[model samples]
Target chain A: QIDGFVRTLRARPEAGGKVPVFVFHPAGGSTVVYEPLLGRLPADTPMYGFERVEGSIEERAQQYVPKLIEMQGDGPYVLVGWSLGGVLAYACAIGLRRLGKDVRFVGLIDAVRAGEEIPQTKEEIRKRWDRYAAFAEKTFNVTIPAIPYEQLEELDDEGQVRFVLDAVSQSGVQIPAGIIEHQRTSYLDNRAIDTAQIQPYDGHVTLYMADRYHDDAIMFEPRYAVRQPDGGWGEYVSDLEVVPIGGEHIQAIDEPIIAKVGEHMSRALGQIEADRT
Target chain B: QIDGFVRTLRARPEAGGKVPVFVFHPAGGSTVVYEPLLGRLPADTPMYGFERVEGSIEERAQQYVPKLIEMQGDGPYVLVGWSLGGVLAYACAIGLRRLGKDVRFVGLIDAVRAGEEIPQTKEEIRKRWDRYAAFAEPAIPYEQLEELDDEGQVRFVLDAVSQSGVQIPAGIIEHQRTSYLDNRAIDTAQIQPYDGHVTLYMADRYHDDAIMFEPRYAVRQPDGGWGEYVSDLEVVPIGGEHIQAIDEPIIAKVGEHMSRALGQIEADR
Candidate 1:
């Protein structure tokens, strides 16, 4: 199980001699969130999702590569990741290529280009729930009372989760208890992946940028960043093609946007299959 | 005629008695561009289009409002325009409201927003042709524009599309050259910021050719450059490249959204 970080979650009835897609889970995230995305991909295409591993990029990549090779057992591989998962995937690609492996396809979903220097402290992180509250209101179409950050910061993680859940449930959009806890844990845990060293990789990356603008949501900002052109990824990757899609950064894997993501990925995987003959 | 600026193209399909839509022609454009869009609209939803009239925004709006009001014969008029046409339609909505008319629906097809400065140079038309060339490639190359004489240039575009095709008359292109350049001069100067709810049917792609001098097209703005003018901006990202958004398959996608929106607006009213 690769120390439980790499768990297999349904990868059959899809690949009729086609490559399987491996989705990287961001920090503190599991393979569970990808079901919506997996359902939308082209028919008969299998999916395997990875959980966030602890440690720097190289260590993380070293852990994933052997497991990845064991699972697929071949040269050609297709990798799909969002946010920090894309960064880890990029590292994994570098590792796989060093092993003389052929990485056929890579899709980076709003890959983080540059962090505006994420400070190693919770002081700055503590203030973001207000924005999250506002996002939930507009996105869920519910009214959230002012995020009592004062009350929130006073509690421990468990206490804060209980308090926030109580506050959120009163508003009507009952965010699952487990989701709120995972989101909280992941939000704080992403610093390791965010600050880790990222190396330049030579590959064609299809960057699907969210076209809709939401000033309220800070899912990825500098502002989850991408202030410069090409989300500043042209400097890192050897080849890149940017496709503007519907919805914002976090919404990248959510509705309507996922449909487009699946459609594009299906074509990309199809093109890869087409070349095999 | 409103001095021959407003022209009725086709309104007969006349869907389940929904509110009519008025489309304004962008720079050097006419009712023809909207045929792809108009065809896919909900059944019986009539369409009216306006021609490029030379004048300031005030005079153009003054010219259009009377005819627009006369044709629709009611309040709650729905205004829809694309690009420069979006600016003109917005100006007309201002005039229509001043006369106590209700503009219940404002559907802007990629309405040019604030910060899209008036073209500082007369050289901007190259961007338009270059932009058009991306879609009509093999139809007309960007280099071919320079090789052809004025008539030849227009002829080649028509000829390119002819095989592809859209039949244009002889010499109509030469006249539009003047019309388009003139329209560009007046487009930004005429943009009186609109303060109303607008549903912008936005396209996501930019042609790869825009590398050297692209001030506006490079980075997308919050409300398609319409944020300042419109606080209640509803952006619907249409499925295609920018210029081709009003064309097929994409327009049909836009039509599906349009029908639902129009139906809801009718139900709400």
Candidate 2:
């Protein structure tokens, strides 16, 4: 049903065009968050943002009013994601590759990368919840006193469940649980998939990494931050370009990172179009 | 004047209770970006965000306002800079260190941590202008289109000739040309001496970083982002796990990093 969503939006001329930009939103965030990015980008380029079924705020993946362009078969497209959206972009790229579809770019805007992990320890999990609880409290002005890790598991504190709820309430996400569960499973499967699941495709892939700072909610230090005692994941895959945007994780809406993403995508597209001409 | 701004906001009861959080905005983003972060932390912990000057969008460093919390003078005060504000955090930390004052944490959100040379390169300069030109082609949009790059820094001054308070006026810029041109000339002398903790806050996704991907190496990459070389700096990750943290303040990351930095400072000899 969610996949059909792509077709419906493609039916809308305004939503799907010669150069389509398909966006994958995070777990609680539905297609709505990208509504701003849609208007922010070059309008001539059709924009389509997807809501993950398994990552909804509610118990099921909610239905959405389909766009006309989604209903039509579109030309080549560009894929982009933010946070969980970034992960989706990676997975979608794999799917697109299997189908032999042409993708101009696969971009991840500060997402949980290929090899990242969710801490299994109660103490770590509690730390995670505290950070997210703080995010919920801060971004939305809501209050959920920080809960510890052991307490979370004892009370059915699943990361996916909490993430969906937090994204929903804080960012006004509305995907139902069933769909969220499905996508959650898919997210899990994709994570465990072999290297082929995320090997760079024929098209250009860019990761718009928004810098993490005091204002971020991430609990662990990213493996690729400017200086990692280990070799950084500079080019995690072939034909991939990493552009670090200047801003906290969520501020992409207003920071130069948004503009930089648009700029890089536009430039990459221009080069591709020029090559075709 | 910057201190005055701090005093005015710190006077608020809601902000005066604990060690305050200093929020820095990137270019074109006012205190509005960090507004969401204020309510996320523990209550009674005051927070303050800075505003960007009118015409100076690209000149993120010049208009930086440090959050100096003297009441908690032992200094667990944090400077959280998002985007351009991240750069300002570094600048303020540098200034504080020079003045011999104590700084707790310099949290730089996805900022220009790379050396000053990257943004000054011809290619970067051209890309910056091309973006602005595209924005300005149809219309100036209230002169915002001009603030996209360094050259815009010049026009930003011309656009607002009579603006007040640390504005980037072209005339004043010309008058201070000596200082502006000296960005490349680093003298051996320290200005304001203060030893503090420096945290290179980075976003893992969007901006450009040009450095060898050596896990432990800190070098400049031709692309954009820089590896941090600050003394006693710890890399705290906030940009990847959560969405808002990647772009705005991730309250949890901030609290944890603050705890670590403050804890470390407290435990220091």
Candidate 3:
């Protein structure tokens, strides 16, 4: 399955030799989520979108890392993805470079670091997880639009997802396929994310943040906002670029917002090519 | 080949559910180095030997640890090794337990540790390495062994070997394999022997002045030995046990050592 996927993707139309762009997918999305990205990318830019599996994102990233480098050959490449996929793309770019590949840029659309795992004092992770079990029971067989990102903060990260998963599944919203399969084979197995290497990429990076919300006047809550400190991603990365895409966090799925993200990515990739010449 | 070779060896004699006896091999030897010890070990005891793929004893031991545990399972076990293997056996016993394995005894036979890395100047290490390199380059393998103990503090070790009645383990017989540990291996002694853990056993300590090469003039070094301080193994049973014996007394000694180790394991809990 992976062989055919790699062969088909590696053959994408390219103007020059190839830009070698690896696309990462969001938690709820798959490589198919990036179908619209095809027209937005540079023509002749060889594109590779890794289909993410579910479960632990970090593990899934690790497993695919060696394979990602093998398929792309060696040297400089660009990474692009949205939300969770964005983080995975950055990790892939970093993983490739450490293996002596030339990683030109890592574009993160909307993601957060695993940072010192947030201490949950009131409820331990296990109890928090139990809440998810309950939510899953209630929401099975349902359809519902995503709640505003602000309301999600009240629920622990897992709780927010449990509520949504249970409510939406019960409502009969069309759930995406192949995602769980990917999780089993890649993500859940601890193959998905290389946090250390990816976080410290010594290459061009662009973080595009969404700034709009449906319910609240403010597009993003403070925590979900893209406000990396001076020495944060903006400074830690050797060369970095940031672009604010004006929309709600959920609006990233909107077509117009995604196109703007491509523009920001093109800027980062452009700087990468310019530096080489 | 060493990369895949290790995985192949990990398939046998699982540890933990049964009391694990991890036998360690020093530089130059592979996993089967402890085959000699198997006959000495009890028939019911499930035993496995450890081999460092490459590098110094500590480097090899620490690096391939994942494979070790994967094969050894979660442990409540004992570790035994000689010389370089002794160092690893100590490391595995402590490290595995720290990783939540139940580790009991660490038995070191005539191994060098903390104060044992022989005093040598930088000039001495370089000179000894050069002399050994010359022997290796010309492919004059035989000549290398003749002057083998000359340049480094190894000459002192060789002198001690005969004096202490310690024959090199049968496992380290080849030249290429020997050089890998003595010359190319990482300096495992970089950290103190036992690395702050207690040793479960040791040979009689012989304090020697470099010039007096024979064991006759040897005086016991102060402090019973590293094992006396860190591990609780006492010298009460030493009269009947020889370093190489597998008879009933040696087995009893191992059990005695295991009992102390198991107690420590329980105490740490």
TM accuracy, model 2: 0.39
Q: TM-score winner among the candidates?
A: 1
Please give, for residues A224-267, the per-residue lDDT of candidate 2 as tens digits: 24432111333344334455554566776444457666665676
Ranking under lDDT, best-scoring first?
Answer: 1, 3, 2
For model 3, the interface Cα RMSD in angstroms equals: 31.7
Instruction: Compare the candidates by lDDT and give the number of the best one.
Output: 1
Candidate 1 deviant stretches above 4 angstroms? A1-3, A13-16, A114-184, A212-222, B1-269
Over all chains combined, what TM-score does candidate 1 have?
Answer: 0.45
Writing each residue's lDDT as its tens digit, candidate 2 over B24-83 gives 655444555664555444545566666543333224333442334343444555677665
lDDT of 1 by residue, B107-190 (tens): 777653432563543245556556566654354466656654434555566677668756656578557655545444443454
lDDT tens string, model 3, B182-230? 4334242443433333443333332332112222223222122343334
Ranking by DockQ: 1, 2, 3
TM-score for chain A, prediction 2:
0.58
Model 3 regions lying over 4 Å from their true place: A1-10, A13-16, A53-58, A113-117, A120-122, A130-199, A212-238, A267-277, B1-269
Chain A TM-score values for every predicted structure, listed in order: 0.70, 0.58, 0.63
TM-score of each: 0.45, 0.39, 0.36
- Among incorrect, acceptable, medium and high, the docking class of model 2 is incorrect
